[PDB]
Design a protein around this ligand. Structure first.
Ligand SMILES: NS(=O)(=O)c1cc2c(cc1Cl)N[C@H]([C@H]1C[C@H]3C=C[C@@H]1C3)NS2(=O)=O
Ligand SMILES: NS(=O)(=O)c1cc2c(cc1Cl)N[C@H]([C@H]1C[C@H]3C=C[C@@H]1C3)NS2(=O)=O
Ligand SMILES: N[C@@H](CCC(=O)O)C(=O)O
Ligand SMILES: N[C@@H](CCC(=O)O)C(=O)O
Ligand SMILES: [Zn+2]
Ligand SMILES: [Zn+2]
Ligand SMILES: [Zn+2]
Ligand SMILES: [Zn+2]
Ligand SMILES: [Zn+2]
Lengths: 261, 261
């Protein structure tokens, strides 16, 4: 028995990042971040050894409408490439039907990121104007939220977003962030609040979150349907939440060493 | 097949008796957030149910000597109810004996004061005595404090467990009434969700002060390994994603509110 648990995750600040001198280190030591600290804690409390591995396609997880094949981390779990996922992977209905999620370890909601000074303070504002273009991340839960909403106003935004050109979608969060920064207030980015708040406390401190969140959910630790890790992992998340560890890690990576004062 | 027995608790604004309940029968006697949620869950899972108010009026705790569970948790554990649809907090000790769906509402332990009371946080309370403070018996908030190592809370616990007259109450309505009648000499520790509701109701003399002490949520509970478990979880995710949960929240907290705004 006793096998090293394969952990799929994704390079997304400040969840998982490459260490300054990663080239001179090996294994799990090459990485640092919120999810790296949580992984160690989860493995420690569940009593298993693990190996962190970055998803090959660098995606979170979506199902191709044609081929019906899941990509990103969800795919890793569904097709047997990984035993567990420890990343900012949002708990959703479609995913929940093919994989298991522990109770959420972090909260978030879809929010709006703008370049400071951009005349926009809500989603209503974005769906009403047109000088300012907006989009989301590809293959993520935010894009799905809009494509599946039945709430008139969000459908209105979807109607615009997926027919807009040039494309308003981006491959990575960093890509969307740069687009906001280089577009002089003519591009707003729809992303999860946790990430929005993180970038907000980072140089050059030129972005900010405006308005309230569009929804409420959280990230969960995922495992293959019917896996035997699920039970213990869930109990580990509950213990860590009640002992204050999750709150501690949140401040450590978001606010403790923020650089916008 | 058989009608589902639903244990819940009389707690505003989750479950309350309609002003004309005397002339009503069955589930129609009640109204509230959880009343509406149960109707939704039942419809999406395809079952008929009977709302039953928990016998002892408690949420659920374990007697340290007999190891017997009381409240809604006991109802589930001893086979008296098939499901619990109420503002029941997801906790480690409970998860060991019953199952919880994904959270359907967020909350954190908070502080309620009579408007004008000189308290801005948990520290202000911990380091003084002219103002007494307590929690609800047989609940998760009380457990939080008796298991808190975090310096300030452990200190708050030592005071609470010994103060005379008793600082604890057996219903939220009791704790709230005591706050309103003590002239700022008593502060109450309760979940933010309930604190916020009371704050919007006349006589509009109470206040939510400081930030939350922790972060968690309520979940629909079922007996371990119960059949309903899976369907109920999928329903909560669906209700959450289609905006149904957000809709009920505004309906029962802000929509109809008495303190203006
Ligand atoms: N804002 S709230 O308190 O009304 C609230 C809180 C929450 C909601 C939905 C609403 Cl509306 N959904 C999430 C649920 C959706 C999926 C992600 C976490 C669970 C499963 N739980 S939550 O984070 O506890
Ligand atoms: N504040 S946070 O975003 O760092 C955060 C968010 C959450 C935490 C803990 C922290 Cl610290 N715990 C809860 C967990 C505790 C139990 C109640 C809901 C789950 C199970 N999930 S959560 O509501 O998503
Ligand atoms: N956390 C999201 C990805 C980011 C986003 O969609 O904005 C997911 O799990 O799909
Ligand atoms: N929601 C709590 C009861 C209220 C409280 O503890 O403040 C529970 O499930 O025990
Ligand atoms: Zn490098
Ligand atoms: Zn630990
Ligand atoms: Zn406006
Ligand atoms: Zn419905
Ligand atoms: Zn102590």
């Amino acid at each position: 028995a006793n096998k090293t648990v394969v952990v799929t995750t994704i390079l997304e600040s400040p969840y998982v990042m490459m260490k300054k001198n990663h080239e001179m280190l090996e294994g799990n030591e090459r990485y640092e971040g919120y999810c790296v600290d949580l992984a160690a804690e989860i493995a420690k409390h569940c009593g298993f050894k693990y190996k962190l591995t970055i998803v090959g396609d660098g995606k979170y997880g979506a199902r191709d409408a044609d081929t019906k094949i899941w990509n990103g981390m969800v795919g890793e779990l569904v097709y047997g490439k990984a035993d567990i996922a420890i990343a900012p992977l949002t708990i959703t209905l479609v995913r929940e039907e093919v994989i298991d999620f522990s109770k959420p370890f972090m909260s978030l909601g879809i929010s709006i990121m703008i370049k400071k000074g951009t005349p926009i303070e809500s989603a209503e504002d974005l769906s009403k104007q047109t000088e300012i273009a907006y989009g989301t991340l590809d293959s993520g839960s935010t894009k799905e939220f809009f494509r599946r909403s039945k709430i008139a106003v969000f459908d209105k935004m979807w109607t615009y977003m997926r027919s807009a050109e040039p494309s308003v979608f981006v491959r990575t969060t960093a890509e969307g962030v740069a687009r906001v920064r280089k577009s002089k207030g003519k591009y707003a980015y729809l992303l999860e609040s946790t990430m929005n708040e993180y970038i907000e406390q980072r140089k050059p401190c030129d972005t900010m979150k405006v308005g309230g969140n569009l929804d409420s959910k959280g990230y969960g630790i995922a495992t293959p349907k019917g896996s035997s890790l699920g039970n213990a992992v869930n109990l580990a998340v509950l213990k860590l939440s009640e002992q204050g560890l999750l709150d501690k890690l949140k401040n450590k990576w978001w606010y403790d060493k923020g650089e916008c004062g």
